[PDB]
Each structure stands twice: as C-alpha cells, then as structure tokens.
Design a protein around this ligand. Structure first.
Ligand SMILES: COc1cc(C(=O)Nc2cc(C(F)(F)F)ccn2)ccc1-c1nc([C@@H]2CC[C@H]3CCC(=O)N3C2)n2ccnc(N)c12
Ligand SMILES: CN(C)CCCC(=O)N1CCC[C@H]1c1nc(-c2ccc(C(=O)Nc3nccs3)cc2)c2c(N)nccn12
Length: 265
C-alpha cells in the first residue's frame, strides 16, 4: 500500500489537523487527495504502520477512504480522500449554512452508517467526536481517525486523568474503570448527535472536564438541543443509559434514525 511520493503534487495548505499538517493535492496529476504529514515523535510508528496496512482493507462510503502511505522517508505521509468542507466541528459552527433539521439528521445518519460498518468489523473508533468527522464537497459527513488514539505517544491524550482525554464523550464506566467497548462508542455517538443539533457547541459547555465527570457519575446528562425534536432527542438519550448493555447497537440506532427521517422529512 506504498504510494510513490513523486506521484503527489501539493496544491494548498489545509491547516494543522490532529498530529500533523495536511495539504490538498493531486495523485498522478488527475486525482484529488489530502496528504497528512505525521508529526515526528507523536505516533508509535512501527505499530501505527502495521495497523495502517490492515486499515487499507476497511472501506465504506461513509469512512474517509485511506489511499496509501509514504514511509520510505520522514515525516511519514498518509494519503486519503480529500474532504473539501473540512472538519465537521468547524462546518457546524459556520452560521452561514443555515442548516435545516433534515440536513442535521442526515449528518447523524452518515456517521451512524460508518459506525455500523466498523461495528460489523468489530473495530472500535475509541475517539468519536465532531472534531474527527470530515465533510466532502457534496456535504456528506464521513468518519476519520478510527482506532488512531492507540498509537498516540503523548500521555495527556491517552489516560482518563490526562488534560487532552475525551472526558466529554466518555461513558461512566470509561471515566471510572477504563472499561472501553462498542457501548463506549455508542455513548460518544449520542454526544456527537448532540454536537450536530447544537451547531457545534462544546458538550457540558459551562463545566470543566472534572465537573463533567462528577455530573455523569451523579446520573445527569446533556439536555435537549433547541433544534432536536422529541423523537431525535430520544435517540441521542438512548445512547447514554447508565448500564452499557441497555444502550442500543449502531444497527438499531440506524433503523431509528431512518424511521425519524421517514416520519419528519
Ligand atoms: C490526509 O488528511 C487527513 C488524513 C486523516 C487520516 O490519516 N485518517 C486516518 C488514518 C488512518 C491510518 F491509516 F493512518 F491508520 C486510520 C484512520 N484514519 C484524517 C484527516 C485528514 C484531513 N485533515 C484535514 C484538515 C486538517 C486541518 C483541520 C483544521 C480545519 C479543518 O477543517 N481541518 C481538517 N482534512 C481536510 C480535507 N481532507 C482530509 N482528508 C483532511
Ligand atoms: C478511475 N479509476 C480507474 C481510478 C481510481 C483512482 C485511484 O487509483 N486513486 C484516487 C487517488 C488515489 C488513488 C488510489 N486509490 C486507491 C483505492 C481506491 C479505492 C479502493 C476501494 O474502493 N476498495 C474497496 N475494497 C473493498 C470494497 S471497495 C481501494 C484503493 C489506492 C491504493 N490502494 N493505493 C494507491 C493509490 N490509490
């Protein structure tokens, strides 16, 4: 799955993403691609390169497509599908889009289809959130960075007490016992639906991570975003059951989202 770095033409700087600078470019001059230059010393390179090869086999219309890697040089390059509208979090925050609620539900649906596919391959995302989803030129949302938190060397991102750990997207059993499962991705998906319907607000926006972890242990939850109907709110709320085995699967969530789309749309 090695891409010859000479087949790449760099056209525009997209900014600093998670763990490296990204550029827009062409592969063989004709095909649009995004090129991420992995920050040196930020990943467990041998483990990361071993997993990157297995992930080229994961393919779904709602997963950002991995095209190949350039590892015969440093920094390492990762070549993927170009997502012209950038990260979902910044896309939600641009008030000029004047999103209809049908568009917000379609974004949830896109992510849910990607997660149902990863769940079918017994593959955990481990850091699902709007900052990790990307948006293409047609407004289609796709999931990225699935499983990458495992190769991050900086301890501030890795452990529950860390300053960069996704406390606001974590269920009680993750915060208390480091119990990761498909049900911790389900909880994070409910939080992501909340981010979409809140147009990119920070979950628990008036709390610190420490206060959020206490609110959750007491059984308290995020409350209904103004743009979410009662039926949409029931779906995101079902992801936050205190008991992990009572939370739905991504297949069940997909069926519920499609039912609401047919009813409302
Ligand atoms: C090449 O570009 C990317 C690659 C990956 C990536 O490598 N993902 C990945 C890789 C693997 C593995 F194979 F390496 F293991 C497994 C799973 N996922 C993830 C995201 C991008 C990526 N990052 C950005 C922007 C960076 C600046 C910020 C700031 C503002 C904005 O919109 N941003 C988004 N993009 C923009 C457009 N297209 C992209 N594909 C992309
Ligand atoms: C027009 N056409 C002929 C040219 C096609 C355009 C083309 O070749 N492109 C577009 C830009 C980068 C470059 C590129 N694409 C890929 C790729 C694409 C799709 C699938 C897939 O869909 N896999 C699936 N597996 C299972 C189900 S679907 C698997 C691999 C790869 C690759 N593996 N290494 C190197 C370069 N690569």
């Amino acid at each position: 799955w090695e891409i010859d770095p000479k087949d790449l033409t760099f056209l525009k700087e997209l900014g600093t993403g998670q763990f490296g600078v990204v550029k827009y470019g062409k592969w063989r001059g004709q095909y649009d691609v995004a090129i991420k230059m992995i920050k040196e010393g930020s990943m467990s390179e041998d483990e990361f390169i071993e997993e990157a090869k297995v992930m080229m086999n994961l393919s779904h219309e709602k997963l950002v497509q991995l095209y190949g890697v350039c590892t015969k040089q440093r920094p390492i390059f990762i070549i993927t599908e170009y997502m012209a509208n950038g990260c979902l979090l910044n896309y939600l925050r641009e008030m000029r889009h004047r999103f209809q609620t049908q568009q917000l539900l379609e974004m949830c649906k896109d992510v849910c289809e990607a997660m149902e596919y990863l769940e079918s391959k017994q593959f955990l995302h481990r850091d699902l959130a709007a900052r990790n989803c990307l948006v293409n030129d047609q407004g289609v949302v796709k999931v990225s960075d699935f499983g990458l938190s495992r190769y991050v060397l900086d301890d501030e991102y890795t452990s529950s007490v860390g300053s960069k750990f996704p406390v606001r997207w974590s269920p009680p059993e993750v915060l208390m016992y480091s119990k990761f499962s498909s049900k911790s991705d389900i909880w994070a998906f409910g939080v992501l639906m909340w981010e979409i319907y809140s147009l990119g607000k920070m979950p628990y926006e008036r709390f610190t991570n420490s206060e959020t972890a206490e609110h959750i242990a007491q059984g308290l939850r995020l409350y209904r975003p103004h743009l979410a109907s009662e039926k949409v709110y029931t779906i995101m709320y079902s992801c936050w059951h205190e008991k992990a085995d009572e939370r739905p699967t991504f297949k069940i969530l997909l069926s519920n989202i499609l039912d609401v789309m047919d009813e409302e749309s």
